[PDB]
Design an enzyme around this catalytic site. Sequence first.
Site, PDB file in Angstrom:
ATOM      1  CD  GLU A  35     -57.691 -40.951  -0.895  1.00 49.32           C
ATOM      2  OE1 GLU A  35     -56.790 -41.142  -1.760  1.00 49.32           O
ATOM      3  OE2 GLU A  35     -57.613 -40.121   0.035  1.00 49.32           O
TER       4      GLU A  35
ATOM      5  CG  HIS B 107     -61.886 -29.511   0.210  1.00 51.81           C
ATOM      6  ND1 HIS B 107     -60.970 -28.729  -0.460  1.00 51.81           N
ATOM      7  CD2 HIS B 107     -61.191 -30.545   0.740  1.00 51.81           C
ATOM      8  CE1 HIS B 107     -59.764 -29.256  -0.320  1.00 51.81           C
ATOM      9  NE2 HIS B 107     -59.866 -30.352   0.408  1.00 51.81           N
TER      10      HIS B 107
END
Lengths: 332, 332, 374, 374
Positions: free
Chosen positions: A66, A136
Amino acid sequence: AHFEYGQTQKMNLFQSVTSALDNSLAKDPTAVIFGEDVAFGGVFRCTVGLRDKYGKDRVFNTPLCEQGIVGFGIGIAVTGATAIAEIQFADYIFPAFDQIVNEAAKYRYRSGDLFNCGSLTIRSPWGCVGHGALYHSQSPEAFFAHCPGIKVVIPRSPFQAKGLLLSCIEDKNPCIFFEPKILYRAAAEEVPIEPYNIPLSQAEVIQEGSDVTLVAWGTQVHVIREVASMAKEKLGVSCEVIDLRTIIPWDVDTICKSVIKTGRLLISHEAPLTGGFASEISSTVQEECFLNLEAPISRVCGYDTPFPHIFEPFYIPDKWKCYDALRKMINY
Amino acid sequence: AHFEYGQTQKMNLFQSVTSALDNSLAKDPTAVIFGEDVAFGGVFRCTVGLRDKYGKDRVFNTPLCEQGIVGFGIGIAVTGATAIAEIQFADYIFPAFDQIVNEAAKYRYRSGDLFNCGSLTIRSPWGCVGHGALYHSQSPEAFFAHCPGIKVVIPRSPFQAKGLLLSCIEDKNPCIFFEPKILYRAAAEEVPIEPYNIPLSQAEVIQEGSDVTLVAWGTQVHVIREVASMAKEKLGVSCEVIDLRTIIPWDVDTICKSVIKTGRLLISHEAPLTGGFASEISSTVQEECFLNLEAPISRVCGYDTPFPHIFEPFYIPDKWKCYDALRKMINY
Amino acid sequence: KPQFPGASAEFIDKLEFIQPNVISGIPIYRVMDRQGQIINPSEDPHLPKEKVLKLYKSMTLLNTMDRILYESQRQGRISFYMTNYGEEGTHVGSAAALDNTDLVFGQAREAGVLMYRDYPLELFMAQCYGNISDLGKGRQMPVHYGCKERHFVTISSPLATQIPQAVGAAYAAKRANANRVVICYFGEGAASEGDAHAGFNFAATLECPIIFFCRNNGYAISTPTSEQYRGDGIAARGPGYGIMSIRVDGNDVFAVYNATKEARRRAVAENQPFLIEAMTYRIGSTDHPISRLRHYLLSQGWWDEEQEKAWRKQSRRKVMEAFEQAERKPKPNPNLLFSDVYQEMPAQLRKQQESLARHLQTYGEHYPLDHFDK
Amino acid sequence: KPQFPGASAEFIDKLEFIQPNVISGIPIYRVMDRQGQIINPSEDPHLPKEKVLKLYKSMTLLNTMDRILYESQRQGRISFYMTNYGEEGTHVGSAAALDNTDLVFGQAREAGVLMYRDYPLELFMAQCYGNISDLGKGRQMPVHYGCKERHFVTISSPLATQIPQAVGAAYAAKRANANRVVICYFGEGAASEGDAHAGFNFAATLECPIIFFCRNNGYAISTPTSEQYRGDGIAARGPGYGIMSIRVDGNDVFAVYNATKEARRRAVAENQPFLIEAMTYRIGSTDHPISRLRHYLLSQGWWDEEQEKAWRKQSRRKVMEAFEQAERKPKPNPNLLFSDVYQEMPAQLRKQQESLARHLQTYGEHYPLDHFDK
Ligand SMILES: Cc1ncc(C[n+]2csc(CCOP(=O)(O)OP(=O)(O)O)c2C)c(N)n1
Ligand SMILES: Cc1ncc(C[n+]2csc(CCOP(=O)(O)OP(=O)(O)O)c2C)c(N)n1
Ligand SMILES: [Cl-]
Ligand SMILES: [Cl-]
Ligand SMILES: [K+]
Ligand SMILES: [K+]
Ligand SMILES: [K+]
Ligand SMILES: [K+]
Ligand SMILES: [Mn+2]
Ligand SMILES: [Mn+2]
């Protein structure tokens, strides 16, 4: 479950994102889309069909890194090309936090506008999903709200998502667009096929009312809409329901004009209370609307814990939590 | 420039940090200190002499990788050993943001207390320094305040720093201790040579007063002390001056007890206004002290920009800015 | 025989760990010896006299400016400085091998690249003083240079952040059919950051025309390389990412030039990254490349003591003319601390601008307003 | 001859880029062929019958549990699952080569390590159901296992974060004179994260007794390795950090065992890191190792069809007894969402706990409280 622009079709929120991205790559030959697993269409299907339509050089997978995705996207944008980066879950944006806060947000300022990365947009799935647990489910907008130079935008529906995403893609500043993932396959609504824009830094009053102002964003707008309905039915209380839409820079004027009228405000968000963005709205409204406040401003937020798996129904600021807080506020 | 524990010596704030670290490695054989350039004593001299006294295995340099420093420190702490990590400037803590927020803060919760990293402390120079510009001046505490599971502590002086740092080192939770670097070589004060502790999550009322409460932390406590003096002299206004000390979990009770008494609150910090930690204090005090508030709660903070080089004198929330806001508040 | 997707290899039927070759590492390419003599004639780039004198005058002018601005920092006239000593050959040798429009991302100690690209002395000075001529508007720490005209992306303090950015700019150049390379400089300490692993891998997997130029001077502040890594420096890491790599003598302007010239030619033709690790000596924040090149000039008979004396005088005069001008310019209007945060100042930021202006109307005597514009 | 601190090397007088060897990469160590036959007798570890049957029963029991819990997820009885198919040999072969008290940091697909360490089926199930027997208190997503008793650090979703943590735990073990190793598992996609570069370099420079165990199954979700890296997989990166490295056939339990056993012996003696890259086939979130080992057993005459049938029945019965128990246990008290955020709940967090309890007193009919404890 806890909750005039030409031809339209019914689209769910993932489809509306694909439509925005398709419209963007059709009209902007510089634009590219990249991140983990975007080539086959993405883990939430947001990029389906785009690589076949626009080419492998324009919709492509990166390595699993990322910090690299965001740095790479900044570099594309330094050359003037539109860079639409994907972070697979907002919970995994934090490896890129230094590239976002120390680099993207400060790029134009620190160079005196000799260089910029305005043509970067980072899009990422966001918010709870029933069973996503710690990694999540997160809603990280308050971490970004304290960083001058980026914009943070969160839609509440398919029509809102496509118009706000096209505005982020075209805005001349680096933008983070958080897509509420529990809405990706929820109810469709009619969304224009061709491009259109919804302004940034503009809240929307979706229901007028006179006794209390309710403010939220993302999926939580649907919760406060329901709360408005409970309050009307159970208490005869008229609620003005506002979707903030842009977290920063936020629409202070629309919120304060509402509170000057109603005299009461309740703000709600899934993110934890402490340091959450309701803290900024509350403290600003207090400063601007002090003499109008009939009761303290209420924040109904996630608890100050990580986001749990089995306990999610008890963690979230659901309509009962919001309604009970609203009842206390009306009675203050 | 904009601003009973046994034998003591005069120490500046860097010396007080070295004394805390020396006391810790003397009494805890597991403890180690590591980061960039710590072996020769550090770029701000905080670790001078420690490697020669305690050994190269206990005070040592890492590679130049902040995400690695924090991950490594978490791992030491998982085994129960005390890990005192250094981040060279708080501006460079952001590469480690994922290790801090997604890992250190959630380690105990997510394992049901089967594993933890409580014996980690991260210490880092913080705050403005006259000419540090964008990357040697930051005050990142509000980014960490929104992350349940870490503690964030900021001292205002040498005596406060040693006692709060020893408390962080010994606290059974991962702690970030931000050392105001403009104080490192500023005025000394008497600091005990042997270990002592100052509690976390406890504010300190350093001057009692009855008309207004002023809250700050780090170097800004000295600014509001001066403002209290200006207000007394120029306006006959009595100010209660409070050092918050711990950003999270913060001492809500001490602040609210003060505001219930005075009826007014001004909070000041160098970090930017929007999303800054004054937003959390203001919105909480409003909720708890609503009926007592005589005037809106005032936040006098850095502007919502990156931290500039040549413009620093105009950027910071100095005593004139705080005093002018206080005067308006008294007159509201 | 093995059919695994992740690697192309044979089976082996004996357990054997692969050992690193660190004691006999990748050798250091050299073109000229310490006496300025060309070692292998087939490697001599035979650069023309005017270009070799531009290399030498750029390095020495950088050294002249460094001495003056380093004294300026010791006196508190600027808040910070850091010299280019020992890095003049790497800075200038590599910049000479680029095309003028190749985009540069720097690391810290790149002033010689700007010097070779004819960046005015006035503008190096303006950034260090934060005066009204700084196009950076006085916002960054000194020795944070940038120039859009000369394709030199503004430097930022965080180490290694520019590495994956440079890779993105190189991917965009490839799509634009730019026939442009990107070069990215970084030190051996910065190569330990996670962003370097990101940039190196992305450049290889996305096939980007980029030169990674690592300056290995043996130290990162107080940290020697024995505490920074245990492989054979940075050049030995390139092949693990699939990147063609070379190590060069950073005190040899011709070795740096030859390696950068060949990396540029191949990166732009092949859309693949190249890694150059230039070894130097950290000589100096607040066996030398110049000496070696002077020895060479004095061979071709291209320089002599009279010319050296005249240039030393002329360069000092130019540096001091720019220094005088820089010190006597005002600083920019304090309103400029609010612009360019976003392209357009948000209304709430304009409100803060207005509040500073009101503040200065009442309390301005308390602010050092005498040499700020307006 | 060169005197640069950053590398030990000779000069070279010709420009030569160092090329990666990717087409003929590091070879794949094998001990037994697909028919279960030992290829090179000097490499056979000649593990005793009871230990080889424990390897086989651990892999097959993991496969039996996977089939049941994968069906449980397809029915919505648990919220998520992900099987261990194709990774049984790597999981179990490596765990068998460790000492029982060596500390494990996992990556994702480590259940076989816990299985080999005799983790109860009840506790795998309790974590997936989030029931009252989960020592994780139901807080994480299914298939996030941890066990303090069995030295298996709780898994977390973010990839690669455990790599530099495992290095820190290994440094602490070295200081404690533990005579313990740490092993850290990660996939080939996770190796692209910056945290892997951090962990690999720190382990080498700080001299840590750690085994890095990379499972290379050719894919990271939809991403093939051609888009993940361009060097010779992960094993070729080790030598660039100074790390001894090997590549092994992950479908060969004996090759995995032999490499892990030797890495452990040397890591603990030498305080140096070792890298093992195990190549497998991603077979399955919501030429096989078991077949190969069965062929071997059936050679030593150590297994037969009758035993296979009996064990398949017995393993199914044990899995189903645990599954029944797990489904009929309640979930933990909702008060447990507030504890362990800090070691002690801050008073403001206790206030939020109390506010949930008041909330449930009034509005509890709206909450799925029937199978939560208390
Ligand atoms: C992310 C980050 N961490 C720490 C620093 C502080 N710092 C400035 S220079 C330096 C050493 C850099 O060493 P190297 O990359 O070898 O460059 P050199 O100074 O030798 O050219 C450090 C640690 C920084 N600027 N950025
Ligand atoms: C930081 C982060 N980014 C993204 C993800 C989402 N994700 C979960 S598994 C996976 C692929 C991992 O591939 P690899 O490391 O090869 O492991 P494998 O699944 O093949 O075992 C991804 C991208 C994540 N968990 N963490
Ligand atoms: Cl424009
Ligand atoms: Cl304890
Ligand atoms: K944008
Ligand atoms: K601690
Ligand atoms: K940088
Ligand atoms: K992890
Ligand atoms: Mn260096
Ligand atoms: Mn994989």
